[model samples]
Target: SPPVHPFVAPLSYLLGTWRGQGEGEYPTIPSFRYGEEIRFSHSGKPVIAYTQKTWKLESGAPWLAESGYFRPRPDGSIEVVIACSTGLVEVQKGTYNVDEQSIKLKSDLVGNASKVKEISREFELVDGKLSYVVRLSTTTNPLQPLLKAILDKL
Candidate 1:
C-alpha cells in the first residue's frame, strides 16, 4: 500500500481498484449500461492519481477513459484535474466532508468544450462500498444526471 499524506488521509479509503457497472444517460443519447473500473493510487506524495475506464456491458467494446489527479489543500479542500478521451478536460474544486464520508466537486474550468458544458461529481463510501453520481451539461442538454454507479473494492 502506498503512504497517504496526512492531509489526504480523509480520502484514503479510495486507494484501491474498484469495479462495477454503471448506467449513463443524456437527452441526446440512449440510456446505456457499461462495465466500469476506477483506480486510485499514490506515490508517497500529497496527491493521488486516478484513472477510470468503461466498456460496453454486452460486447465489451471500449466506451470511455479518463486520467486525473487529486491534491489535498491546507484548508480542508481538494483540487482535481482530469482529462478525458472524449475531448474534455476539467479542473474542479471541492471539499471532502469526513462526517458524511463524501466528496463533492464542481468544475472550475472545462476545456475542449464543444460537446460537454459543465460537470459535477460526488462520491460516497458506505460499508466498504463506493457509489458515485455525475451530472453534466452538454450542448444539447441541461445539467442532468449522466451516470451513477456502485462499486466494490477489488
Candidate 2:
C-alpha cells in the first residue's frame, strides 16, 4: 500500500498550549476527570512527532505518557501510534479533517483469547481547547474518556 497524502505542513497549527478535562466510565466503574498535555514538534526533519501525558485529577496517577512517530499515510490517512506502555501494536488509520479540526481512530486488540474494540476521537484548537475520549467494548463498556490535556506549547 502507498501513502495516501504527501506531507502537508499542518504542523504549525498544533504548536501551542491547551487545556481540558474528561470523564471516563466502565460497566460499573465510576468516571473521573482526566487532564494532561500534548506537544507536537519537528526538528527540521521529514517526520513530525507528538507526545502525550495523561493523568487523573484526584489520585494524580500518571495514567498514560507516551510518544509516537506520525507520518502521512499513503492513502491520505493519518498513521496510527504504537505505545509500549499500553501494549497496543497497530497502525490506527484516520484523517485530520482540517476543516473540522478533528481526528478519529479505531483499534482492535486480542487479549486473553478475546478481541477488544476501541474507538477514540480528538478535537484540537490553537487556544488550547481540546476534547478527547475513548470507548472500549471488550474490557469495559461505558465509554471511558482518555485525552484531556492542557498543552502549554513551548
Candidate 3:
C-alpha cells in the first residue's frame, strides 16, 4: 500500500494524534471536566483505527478510555464500532462529508445493559482544529448534550 486506501483518504484529516480539554454535563450527573487525548491511525486498510482517553481535568486521575474502528465507504456512509472501558459497546452509523470535513453519527446498537437509549455525535474541522459534541439519551432522560471538546492537531 503506497498510500492511504482510497476510502480512508477521505478522512485523513483525522489520522493523527490530538490533544484537548473537554467538559461534560447531563441531567443525572454532576457537571465535570477532563483533558483528552485522541488518536486516529491508518494502515492502508480503508479503516480509521481510533482511540480516546480522558483524565480528570484537575487531578490527572484517569477517567475513561475507548477505542474503535471507523469504516468509511465510497458513498460517504460510515460505521463506527467501539468498545469502552466502562462496559459499553456501541455500533454507530453515520455519514462523512468530505467537502466539509465533518462527521455525524447516531447509535444503531448499544449493549452491555448500559441503559443508554441513544447516542449521537458531531465532529467538524474548522481551520485545522477539530471540535466535537456528543449527546446521549438514557432510560431516565431524553437526548441532551453530554460533552463538547475542541482539539489541536499535533
Candidate 4:
C-alpha cells in the first residue's frame, strides 16, 4: 500500500506551475545566476511530481540542465531519488510543513560518496506573487549564502 499521513491534505494548494529567477554567489567561484521553470502536478493517486529546468547565464555564456520526480507519501513527506551522469544516485527525503500562506520543505541527500542537506521555503499568494529561499550544506562546502527566487504563475 502507499504511504499515508493526515498532514498531506494541506499541500494540495501547491500543485501548479511556478516560474522564476534565481541568483546566488560562490565564495571561490563567480556569482551564480539563473532562470528556472518549475511544474508541479498530481495524478490524483496520492503522488505529486515535479520537474525543473534551469538556465544559467554568466559572462554571456549559457549552460542549462533539468531534473525532477514524482513522490507520494500521505504524510506530506517523501524520498526523492535522483540519478546523475556524475555517477551519483542521490536518495533524499523531504518534508512539507504547510500553513495557510506558505510551506517549508526540508531536504536531505545521501549517496555512496557524499551527503548533502538543503531546505526550500516557499511563500505565496501575497500581493499576487510567489517567492522562495534555498539554503544548502555539505562537508566540502562552506556555510553558503541563502539564495532567493521570485516566481509568477505561468
Candidate 5:
C-alpha cells in the first residue's frame, strides 16, 4: 500500500487488515456461519479502498465477497460503491465520526439483482476491536439483520 493521504487521515484507523467470525441468517435461506477478513488500505490519494472476504466456518469454503471504496468528503459525509461476487452492485451514502471512531452507511441503490432490495452496514471501533453489522432486505423479507462480526486489528 501507498502512503496515507492527508484527506483520509481521519479514517486512518480503518487502514488495516481485520479478521473475525460472523453469523448470517435470513428468512429466505438457512442460517450459516463464516469467517471473514476485511481490509482498508490507502492509495496515496484521497480515497480509501475496502475489500471483504468470507468463508464457511466448518469447511472453509468461500461464501461471500465484495470490494468497494470509502469516499470521504470535506464536509464529513461518506459515499460508497460496492460490487459483490454475487453480481449485486450497491451505492451507499453515509457519514463517519472520528470522535467516536464509528461509521454508518445505507444503500441508496441496488442493481443487477432480483431479490435484494436494500442493504446497510455499520462499524464501530473501540480499543483494538472493531465490530460490524450488516442488515439487508429482500423481496420476500423486510429489512433485517444479515450478519454481525467483531474483528481484531492485525
Candidate 6:
C-alpha cells in the first residue's frame, strides 16, 4: 500500500468493500430496488479511491456505476470528484464530522449534466455497517430523496 497522509486518517474507516440492497425513487422514473456494491481503497495516499456499481435485483443485471476520489484537504475538509456512467460528473466538498462518524457532501461543480442538476450525500459508518442517503435536484423535480442504502463491510 502507498503511504497515507495523516490528514486522511479520519477517512480510513471506509477502507473496505461493502455490498447490500438499495432503493431508488424519482418523479421521472418508476420506483425500484437494486443491489449495490461499493468499494473504497487507498494506496497510502491522501486520497481514497472509490467505485460503486448497482444492479437490478430482479434480473441481476448491471444498472449503474461510478468512480471517484476522496481527497482530504489540509484544512480538514474533503473534496470528492466523481464521474458516473450516466454521463454525469460532480465535484463535491464537505467536512467529516468525526464525532458522528459521518460525512456530508454537496455538489459544488457539475459537468455533462443530464437530468440531474445537483446532488448531496450523507454517509455514516456505524456498527460495522455503512448507511447512506442521497438527495438530488433534477430537471424533472426539485430536491428530493433519490436513493438510500445499507451495507455491511466485507
Q: Residue-wise lDDT of candidate 5 within 1-52, one digit each (tens)? A: 5778877988998988999898888877798779999999877999998999
Question: How does candidate 2 score on lDDT?
Answer: 0.56
Tens digits of per-residue lDDT for model 1, 35-123? 99999999878898999999999999989999999987767799999999988899988998887888899988889887778899989
- TM per candidate: 0.93, 0.67, 0.96, 0.65, 0.93, 0.93
Indicate the worst ten consecutive residues by lDDT in candidate 5.
1-10
TM-score of candidate 6 versus the correct structure, residues matched by position: 0.93
Off by over 4 Å in 4: 1-9, 57-62, 70-90, 112-128
Error of 3 at 59 (Å): 1.3
lDDT of every predicted structure (CA atoms) = 0.90, 0.56, 0.92, 0.57, 0.89, 0.88
The prediction achieving the highest lDDT against the true structure is 3
lDDT of 4: 0.57
The Cα error of candidate 5 at residue 144, in Å, is 1.3
lDDT of 6 by residue, 1-154 (tens): 6666787888888888999999999888799899999999988777899999999998999999999999877666888999999988999999888778888899998789877788998899878799999999988789888999999889
- Residue-level lDDT tens digits of model 2 in 1-154: 2222236355346644444456666656565667776666666544556677777877878887667666654344676564635765544556676666666766533223244555554555545455555555555443455434334444
lDDT comparison, 1 vs 3, better candidate: 3
- Which number leads on TM-score? 3
Better of 2 and 4 by TM-score: 2
What C-alpha lDDT, on a 0 to 100 scale, does residue 125 get in candidate 2? 56
Looking at candidate 1, the ten consecutive residues that score lowest on lDDT are 1-10
Model 3 vs. true fold: TM: 0.96
- What is the alpha-carbon lDDT of model 6 when measured against the actual structure? 0.88
CA lDDT for candidate 5? 0.89
